[PDB]
Amino acid sequence: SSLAPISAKDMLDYLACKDKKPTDVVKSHTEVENGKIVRVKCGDIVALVQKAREQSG
Amino acid sequence: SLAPISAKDMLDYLACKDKKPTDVVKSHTEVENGKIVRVKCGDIVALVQKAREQS
Amino acid sequence: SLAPISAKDMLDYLACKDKKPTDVVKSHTEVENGKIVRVKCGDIVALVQKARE
Amino acid sequence: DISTVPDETYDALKLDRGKATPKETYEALVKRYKDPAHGAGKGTMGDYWEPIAISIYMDPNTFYKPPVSPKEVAERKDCVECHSDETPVWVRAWKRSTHANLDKIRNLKSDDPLYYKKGKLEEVENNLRSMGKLGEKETLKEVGCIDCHVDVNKKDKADHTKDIRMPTADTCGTCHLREFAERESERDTMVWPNGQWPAGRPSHALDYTANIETTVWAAMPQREVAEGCTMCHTNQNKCDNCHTRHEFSAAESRKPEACATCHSGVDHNNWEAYTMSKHGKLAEMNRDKWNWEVRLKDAFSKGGQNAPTCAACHMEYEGEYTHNITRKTRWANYPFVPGIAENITSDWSEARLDSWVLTCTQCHSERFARSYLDLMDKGTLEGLAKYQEANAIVHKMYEDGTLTGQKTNRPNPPEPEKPGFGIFTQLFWSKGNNPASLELKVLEMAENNLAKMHVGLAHVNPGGWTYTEGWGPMNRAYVEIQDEYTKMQELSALQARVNKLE
Amino acid sequence: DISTVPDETYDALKLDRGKATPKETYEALVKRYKDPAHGAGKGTMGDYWEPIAISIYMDPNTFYKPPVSPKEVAERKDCVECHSDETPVWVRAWKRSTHANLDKIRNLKSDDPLYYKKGKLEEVENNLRSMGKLGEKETLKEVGCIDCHVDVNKKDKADHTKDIRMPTADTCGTCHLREFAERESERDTMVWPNGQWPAGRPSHALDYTANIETTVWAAMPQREVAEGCTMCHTNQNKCDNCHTRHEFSAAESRKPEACATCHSGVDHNNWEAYTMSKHGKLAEMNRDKWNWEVRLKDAFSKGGQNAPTCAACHMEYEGEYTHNITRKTRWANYPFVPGIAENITSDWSEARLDSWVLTCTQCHSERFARSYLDLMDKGTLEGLAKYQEANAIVHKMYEDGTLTGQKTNRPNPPEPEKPGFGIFTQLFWSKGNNPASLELKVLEMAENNLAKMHVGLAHVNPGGWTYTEGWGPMNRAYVEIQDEYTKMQELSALQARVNKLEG
Amino acid sequence: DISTVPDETYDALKLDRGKATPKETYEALVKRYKDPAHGAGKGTMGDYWEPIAISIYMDPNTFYKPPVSPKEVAERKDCVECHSDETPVWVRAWKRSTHANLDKIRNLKSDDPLYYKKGKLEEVENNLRSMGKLGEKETLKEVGCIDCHVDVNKKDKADHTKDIRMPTADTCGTCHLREFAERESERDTMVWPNGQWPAGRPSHALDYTANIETTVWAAMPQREVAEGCTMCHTNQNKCDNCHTRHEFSAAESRKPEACATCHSGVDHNNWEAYTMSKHGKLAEMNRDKWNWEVRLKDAFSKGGQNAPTCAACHMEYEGEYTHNITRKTRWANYPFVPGIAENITSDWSEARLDSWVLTCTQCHSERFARSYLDLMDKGTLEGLAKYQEANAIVHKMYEDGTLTGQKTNRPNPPEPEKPGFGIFTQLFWSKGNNPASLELKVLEMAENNLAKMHVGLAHVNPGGWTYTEGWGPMNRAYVEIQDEYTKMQELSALQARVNKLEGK
Ligand code: HEC
Ligand code: HEC
Ligand code: HEC
Ligand code: HEC
Ligand code: HEC
Ligand code: HEC
Ligand code: HEC
Ligand code: HEC
Ligand SMILES: [K+]
């Protein structure tokens, strides 16, 4: 069928977490808040993608 | 000096430059009410000939 | 540190090379009241000198 | 059997790979090729547009009739002799072409780098014998005017007012079955896992169909403008856009310049990105040092080529070279197309990435190749995110109904188009405040500037994704979008204060 | 008689074709060429601008005087010897040139495709005998430094401080009478039926005149910017823009690159359109298969050229090739110029269209050529209608006086320019809200985008009239004009609602 | 001694140029080159950014580690044999190159136009003897894979997982001491009298340092976008940007196309301006008539060159040609940089103008050259003046705080950048109304259009400073700035009238 929509930032953060543990914290590739690059926990983004991958198939 | 004729009138005239004054052609430029404006060839040729007459 | 001189004043300084202080040249950049602004050379040289000194 | 044609092509034609003759394969190909259901004809929206004068040369299978003025009955020799005065350069170009010098091809000795052409000639003759246009031991003497423009291997008379045709892809595919079958295999190889694009697209096999299936193309009154789109979208109909008439030089089609006319501009600056990159600049510098007459298989060896070209990169697949250019496509130029970015991590995309690495590893190391292609993907997604944030702003204004003239001056697009937000039609049709400025701006952000960013990334032009194209222009678009939004908010806040006093 | 020169040129020169000597035809040409009334000198607005340093090379007949140093006197040989290290490349480029190897031209064989040059050398020698610069039995030895920079075929010493000149069109015209006469014939052949452009314009014959007769060019204070326009408008004054100094190669001038420096940019992207087209990309791909040394008359046969070039299309007229490029002009780049669109159907334009069909039919069929020329014309008109609709909006605003800062911050343009709407001046001069953004936008929609749309159509570049140039950009301007128009109407409606509450 | 290397270079290294050996010169060169205080490493903002996969090639001395696979031990022969299947074209390009054919350089005759190469080979060999990399009667047999990628003149086994390197500028400069010192001398020659630019800048010597010391490059999260800047700024680290790997053709680097990938685009359209000029158009027409293999000093004689090229103008200094491209720089592309315009009338610039005239007199007269360079100078100032008038308007709005979203939606740039008006960061980073459209438009007016105007002027492209680039687009920016300024003034005047209706 058709793929569930995932934003580019979430795609970047997912790819940034390749070969990394779920507790590893990576910098965003796109987002800046309060004068700093937003940090993302790898466990959250992998969970965010796995949820969407199951929201279509 | 030639009298001013709009570009859209030149197109409609060129589209009618072969056929009858009662024939209807599509515009090359105009869209109204979600459709291409239909132009009667008698209207456009008369508009050009009354402009060429001012010379 | 070199004192700040605007580009228009730099042009007017260039236009006044080998010219008397009473001589008047055209601006290369300025137009006022539909006419190119004329500049007295004594004014522009004084403006440059007070910056370098 | 053709060694370079995919299995799924034969499966789609319902043919056995071991029990199919060149005649049967050609007939299966043309049956699909000339079928209106598979893309031929005027299309679904043919009742909205009519051909103009040039359209008979753009879609000859639908519109072409031979001229009425020269009431002539001619033979093979008459074509060359009369047109020596009527179209002299056409005769001169044909004269120095391979199509007219087939004896030179038979005189090619095995230590000549062009020797493969003899095998191709024998392959052509093989195909013609299978169909019944050539005798088993009769050599094809020449490919002249009467062959392409009337009928292959014709010796009898032809009516200049009845028998003259414009040589389409099937016409070329009579002799050149391999390349025509390779081209038509794009219908079967370019299948997206989640229908990101229609089946067989994007490809040269369905470029004209795509053109005529675009609503604005069919809907817009400016036929002469719309026909500019057609001139770039003719590969489906004719085979003379890379290797042109009437020389039909393969060396010409191998040069980067041959793709430039179509693969350039605001929504795909492939020519601009490539040429400006090291790869393209080296190609410009070393074009004299390379042998373009040598085929793509031997380009990096016998040809002496030390930089990649459009054809070398895009026609290569798993070591083989074909007229199919789809089997490595992942991004498909427009990164904003739904499903495309989400698909970039799939096994389908990864296998196609491996095919690209295979291409790169002919020169660069795998570590180097995979390093830059990682940069291409992420940079592309970085561009997409920038657009997506800016689109969220303008799309919110559309839903609120606050876009300039959205309820006061937003006239409906020409039939059969439906009114909507940020649609392609708004790039070739505009009336009143349809589209709004912000709407066009964010449309152009994706369609033009995001596309060019990825093209710059894909084709290794640093400035093509940073300062000049891509990031730079998208930065400006984002800023101007944000600026107008804030301006239109504080004007709405002021208008409310005036309403609060009435 | 020069058979490539039209009758009307001799008529305007008051000369008989078969009776006029090469000396008489030249002098009558120069008489018109050096006349202020016919375009020479500083022009009608000369009292508003002064020359800069580079102006002595851009317009020598008006501005050039020789350098004060070096104070030197020299013969023919001394010109080469000193400049051999002073201006090394000029000597070498001259040494490679035909002007320095005239004996090689005499030794050319009849079967050689370059033999026409021998006939031209004797053609030149015949011209020089008539003018009393060369003897009846005497042959021209060389065309050297002293010949163009001092005096043709000088046989004595020259003063570097008083005798040095910059070789203008009349300098080259002394020997090359044909090409000078052909170029000057543009004055007589470029006559528009309804005065769409001034007589003899647009042309290379009056390109400098056109430049200096433009109000902004004379009025603007930025002289160095203004002389940037001059550098593209010097064909009238000098003959070294297509075939450059000091090689003066005719083969160079036949290459599309020779036109590019001038025939390019926002308001006429000819180079960009041509090169991106199939015609131009083939010219890039096959430039080594073609013999550029072969004359334009033989290029499509003996040269091997299979794709058209700038020179081949624009210098061809009715089976001839001349330095006159005006006789097939119908649109003249700018489609918005009053009378141009209306004239496109006249017998005058139809005859020039037939001449264009001739040019295309050397390769393509008439049915094909006319099919595309029809697309060109209608497409251009479709572009003009788009602009005209946008202009009707912005022009209305100007007449209503509603443009941003029109009655508040619209300062007058520099003298002798008069204020107006969407005038050319506003492209090279701006102050306050003169021009307004909408005004400049619709100005550029016509000047830049519409012109580029035509060029793209005329030069077969599909993307150059659709996505990238022309229609795409014109779409944006239209949208942005309509958007701002509505915004300013809504602002004016809010303006009135505040004024009501204050009454 | 190296004759082409300036005296100020030796003074910075504390070396007596008369007695200093090649080894000492090289050591002092590398000592500075690999020193963090002189620009090496990650720089001052290193804690704010991390390398990506391709950074190991962009800055090898800092980031490169040999690949884990294959786990193999290899010799000189093995490099060629295996990579003939693994990276086939790289071996092929190396084979048809000079580095693999040093006997072809020894066999060069005195009447050959490429004879100068034999003296360069002998100078390279003398350098390696001084450093101890070559024996006194040993001759350099080849320059192969193991030489650049492991160690110069290596005879023993090498580990693919431990010993492999990406050849940096000091790797090439081991043999090519002259060119490396010529390039490094830009640190010493490019010194501005009033600190207009940082010492040694702009230059190819410190282009990577400049890149990584740019705040937005280190601050921005879009690393793959940031690395696009890096790819144009790698001359400091590697020597393969003009003469590319693996052919390393000097003729190639002499061609205008070699400079194009970097010296092009929105803020410095050098390629665009040069190609469109007569000079560049002639170069495209005459490229088959010129001998590119001939060295730059014989280019206009033995080569037959009659139109100037990027390399010919910018590498030339006082009659001699050198990898230093800084010694004649006066404007430095961006005419808005404080001090630059004020410095154009100094003796420092006037002397460098004499040097340019010299370059031009190769073809033109001095009078002609001084006539056009006067135009370039005054025209550039005329474009600068137009920017400065427009900037006054936008800057006034910033001081007044009346820019759109200045007080409601102006978030701070990523660390360690600090908020400001019309800063470079706002071209590669934007959030909310930082920057505002007017602020970005005036920034680009200087950064892009004023810059391109000068380049157009400097490279003789008439349309490039009038209609198409420079004056035209600046006119538009000025027009649009003025238009918005008026609109916002009468909008705030209307806002004030609504406030008076709220007093009542
Ligand atoms: C219509 C479907 C087409 C037919 C029939 C042919 N072409 Fe092409 N062409 C292109 C390239 C880059 C090459 C070189 C391929 C290589 O070196 O491996 C070719 C070559 C051919 C040949 C072989 C000629 C030879 O002797 O080498 C034939 C018979 C042929 N082509 C027929 C490019 C393109 C292209 C641009 C993308 C298109 C649309 C086509 N070719 C279409 C056809
Ligand atoms: C033989 C009589 C000639 C001719 C026809 C020319 N030269 Fe000379 N020249 C010399 C120097 C030092 C200059 C440069 C002057 C400066 O830049 O101020 C020139 C210049 C020229 C020009 C260009 C003049 C201009 O306005 O730019 C031309 C067209 C020219 N020359 C031609 C030096 C000498 C000599 C000194 C020994 C001699 C003798 C010549 N030149 C000879 C000739
Ligand atoms: C049969 C009569 C043919 C028709 C119809 C067309 N071509 Fe052909 N062509 C034919 C032969 C026997 C050969 C020689 C073998 C070979 O492949 O080289 C060719 C040659 C070509 C080439 C290569 C020319 C060169 O660069 O040397 C090309 C690019 C080519 N042919 C293309 C082509 C196209 C586009 C056609 C349709 C209009 C076409 N050919 C018709 C035989 C026949
Ligand atoms: C085959 C047995 C090899 C021999 C012998 C040598 N190398 Fe190699 N090399 C080989 C492979 C399969 C690869 C690809 C590794 C990858 O993942 O890309 C390489 C790589 C290199 C590289 C580039 C490494 C990088 O960081 O991209 C270089 C510079 C290189 N090899 C050089 C080199 C030298 C100098 C050798 C001789 C001592 C040598 N290689 C031997 C396979 C083999
Ligand atoms: C010592 C072993 C060397 C190293 C390490 C590098 N090069 Fe070299 N190179 C060397 C010699 C003895 C020669 C021949 C003499 C000469 O200078 O011509 C060369 C050649 C070149 C050339 C010229 C090639 C040509 O056009 O014919 C270039 C442009 C060049 N070398 C550059 C270069 C670069 C970029 C290097 C680093 C990767 C490098 N060389 C390393 C000796 C040695
Ligand atoms: C201009 C437009 C246009 C004018 C209006 C029309 C109708 C088309 C049609 C399309 C379609 C549809 C697509 C997407 C592909 C698909 O299957 O649905 C678009 C693509 C396209 C490409 C491919 C870009 C890539 O993937 O890299 C190219 C090369 C195009 C170029 C032509 C062009 C020549 C300069 C002009 C004019 C247009 N197109 Fe298109 N087209 N096109 N196109
Ligand atoms: C893009 C940008 C960029 C992306 C963000 C970064 C970080 C840089 C850094 C700079 C710096 C700093 C300067 C000014 C010089 C200095 O030392 O302080 C700038 C110069 C520059 C030029 C020189 C222009 C001139 O003087 O003529 C060139 C040619 C550069 C080009 C690259 C480029 C390739 C197309 C890309 C991408 C960037 N730069 Fe840069 N750089 N740069 N640059
Ligand atoms: C830039 C401008 C400019 C600078 C302010 C000046 C004063 C001119 C003058 C003209 C005029 C006027 C015309 C129209 C023709 C005429 O007689 O009245 C304009 C035409 C022009 C063409 C012809 C275009 C065509 O195809 O018809 C060309 C090639 C140019 C070229 C230069 C140029 C190219 C980079 C620059 C600089 C200017 N012009 Fe012009 N000119 N010009 N021009
Ligand atoms: K060549």
PDB file of C-alpha atoms and ligand atoms in Angstrom, chain D residues 98 116-117 120 124 169 172-173 176-177 179-181 183-184 204 235 238-243 248 250-251 253-255 258-259 263 293-297 311-312 315 321-323 325, ligand 1:
ATOM      1  CA  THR D  98      26.824   5.672 -40.409  1.00  0.00           C
ATOM      2  CA  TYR D 116      31.345  -3.555 -31.938  1.00  0.00           C
ATOM      3  CA  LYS D 117      29.348  -1.681 -34.611  1.00  0.00           C
ATOM      4  CA  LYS D 120      25.381  -4.278 -34.092  1.00  0.00           C
ATOM      5  CA  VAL D 124      20.149  -5.209 -37.049  1.00  0.00           C
ATOM      6  CA  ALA D 169      10.413   5.089 -31.855  1.00  0.00           C
ATOM      7  CA  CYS D 172      13.804   3.086 -35.256  1.00  0.00           C
ATOM      8  CA  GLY D 173      13.007  -0.037 -33.209  1.00  0.00           C
ATOM      9  CA  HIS D 176      17.403  -1.147 -33.439  1.00  0.00           C
ATOM     10  CA  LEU D 177      15.334  -3.642 -31.428  1.00  0.00           C
ATOM     11  CA  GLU D 179      17.841  -0.005 -27.732  1.00  0.00           C
ATOM     12  CA  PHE D 180      14.073   0.298 -28.318  1.00  0.00           C
ATOM     13  CA  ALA D 181      13.405  -2.663 -25.998  1.00  0.00           C
ATOM     14  CA  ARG D 183      14.037   2.087 -23.562  1.00  0.00           C
ATOM     15  CA  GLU D 184      10.592   0.451 -23.320  1.00  0.00           C
ATOM     16  CA  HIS D 204      12.019   8.503 -21.235  1.00  0.00           C
ATOM     17  CA  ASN D 235      11.499  10.779 -26.134  1.00  0.00           C
ATOM     18  CA  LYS D 238      10.946  10.021 -31.297  1.00  0.00           C
ATOM     19  CA  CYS D 239      14.509   8.734 -30.821  1.00  0.00           C
ATOM     20  CA  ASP D 240      16.405  11.796 -32.079  1.00  0.00           C
ATOM     21  CA  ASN D 241      16.775  13.933 -28.930  1.00  0.00           C
ATOM     22  CA  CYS D 242      20.180  12.700 -27.694  1.00  0.00           C
ATOM     23  CA  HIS D 243      21.557  11.472 -31.026  1.00  0.00           C
ATOM     24  CA  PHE D 248      22.507  10.133 -35.655  1.00  0.00           C
ATOM     25  CA  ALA D 250      26.383   7.920 -30.858  1.00  0.00           C
ATOM     26  CA  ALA D 251      29.425  10.011 -29.863  1.00  0.00           C
ATOM     27  CA  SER D 253      24.623  11.340 -27.536  1.00  0.00           C
ATOM     28  CA  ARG D 254      27.449  10.336 -25.155  1.00  0.00           C
ATOM     29  CA  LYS D 255      28.541  13.958 -24.643  1.00  0.00           C
ATOM     30  CA  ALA D 258      23.131  16.110 -25.516  1.00  0.00           C
ATOM     31  CA  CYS D 259      21.037  16.070 -22.309  1.00  0.00           C
ATOM     32  CA  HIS D 263      17.772  18.453 -18.230  1.00  0.00           C
ATOM     33  CA  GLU D 293      33.197   7.333 -30.695  1.00  0.00           C
ATOM     34  CA  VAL D 294      34.089   4.436 -28.375  1.00  0.00           C
ATOM     35  CA  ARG D 295      31.033   2.992 -26.606  1.00  0.00           C
ATOM     36  CA  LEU D 296      30.198   3.373 -22.891  1.00  0.00           C
ATOM     37  CA  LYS D 297      31.405  -0.145 -21.981  1.00  0.00           C
ATOM     38  CA  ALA D 311      25.372   8.791 -19.982  1.00  0.00           C
ATOM     39  CA  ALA D 312      28.237   7.008 -18.198  1.00  0.00           C
ATOM     40  CA  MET D 315      23.020   4.279 -18.381  1.00  0.00           C
ATOM     41  CA  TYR D 321      25.014  -0.323 -20.275  1.00  0.00           C
ATOM     42  CA  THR D 322      21.452  -0.012 -21.646  1.00  0.00           C
ATOM     43  CA  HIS D 323      19.059   2.701 -22.897  1.00  0.00           C
ATOM     44  CA  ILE D 325      17.901   5.014 -17.129  1.00  0.00           C
TER      45      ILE D 325
HETATM   46  C1  HEC G   1      14.712   5.249 -29.294  1.00  0.00           C
HETATM   47  C2  HEC G   1      14.119   4.537 -28.330  1.00  0.00           C
HETATM   48  C3  HEC G   1      16.240   5.143 -29.489  1.00  0.00           C
HETATM   49  C4  HEC G   1      16.874   4.330 -30.344  1.00  0.00           C
HETATM   50  C5  HEC G   1      16.215   3.323 -31.315  1.00  0.00           C
HETATM   51  C6  HEC G   1      18.301   4.552 -30.202  1.00  0.00           C
HETATM   52  N1  HEC G   1      18.484   5.518 -29.228  1.00  0.00           N
HETATM   53 FE1  HEC G   1      20.308   5.925 -28.327  1.00  0.00          FE
HETATM   54  N2  HEC G   1      22.157   6.370 -27.470  1.00  0.00           N
HETATM   55  C7  HEC G   1      22.278   7.240 -26.390  1.00  0.00           C
HETATM   56  C8  HEC G   1      23.574   7.032 -25.780  1.00  0.00           C
HETATM   57  C9  HEC G   1      24.161   7.761 -24.555  1.00  0.00           C
HETATM   58  C10 HEC G   1      24.253   5.937 -26.612  1.00  0.00           C
HETATM   59  C11 HEC G   1      25.649   5.309 -26.399  1.00  0.00           C
HETATM   60  C12 HEC G   1      25.423   3.950 -25.731  1.00  0.00           C
HETATM   61  C13 HEC G   1      26.694   3.208 -25.408  1.00  0.00           C
HETATM   62  O1  HEC G   1      27.811   3.711 -25.694  1.00  0.00           O
HETATM   63  O2  HEC G   1      26.585   2.088 -24.847  1.00  0.00           O
HETATM   64  C14 HEC G   1      23.300   5.591 -27.638  1.00  0.00           C
HETATM   65  C15 HEC G   1      23.504   4.639 -28.615  1.00  0.00           C
HETATM   66  C16 HEC G   1      22.564   4.141 -29.486  1.00  0.00           C
HETATM   67  C17 HEC G   1      22.768   3.103 -30.478  1.00  0.00           C
HETATM   68  C18 HEC G   1      24.086   2.350 -30.760  1.00  0.00           C
HETATM   69  C19 HEC G   1      24.964   3.199 -31.664  1.00  0.00           C
HETATM   70  C20 HEC G   1      26.372   2.674 -31.639  1.00  0.00           C
HETATM   71  O3  HEC G   1      26.852   2.202 -32.701  1.00  0.00           O
HETATM   72  O4  HEC G   1      27.017   2.730 -30.560  1.00  0.00           O
HETATM   73  C21 HEC G   1      21.611   2.911 -31.108  1.00  0.00           C
HETATM   74  C22 HEC G   1      21.375   1.897 -32.245  1.00  0.00           C
HETATM   75  C23 HEC G   1      20.628   3.814 -30.543  1.00  0.00           C
HETATM   76  N3  HEC G   1      21.248   4.551 -29.556  1.00  0.00           N
HETATM   77  C24 HEC G   1      19.304   3.921 -30.910  1.00  0.00           C
HETATM   78  C25 HEC G   1      21.324   8.146 -25.967  1.00  0.00           C
HETATM   79  C26 HEC G   1      19.965   8.097 -26.206  1.00  0.00           C
HETATM   80  C27 HEC G   1      18.944   8.908 -25.569  1.00  0.00           C
HETATM   81  C28 HEC G   1      19.193   9.987 -24.492  1.00  0.00           C
HETATM   82  C29 HEC G   1      19.000   9.690 -23.204  1.00  0.00           C
HETATM   83  C30 HEC G   1      17.754   8.560 -26.074  1.00  0.00           C
HETATM   84  C31 HEC G   1      16.383   9.163 -25.687  1.00  0.00           C
HETATM   85  C32 HEC G   1      17.975   7.513 -27.053  1.00  0.00           C
HETATM   86  N4  HEC G   1      19.336   7.262 -27.104  1.00  0.00           N
HETATM   87  C33 HEC G   1      17.010   6.869 -27.803  1.00  0.00           C
HETATM   88  C34 HEC G   1      17.240   5.912 -28.772  1.00  0.00           C
END
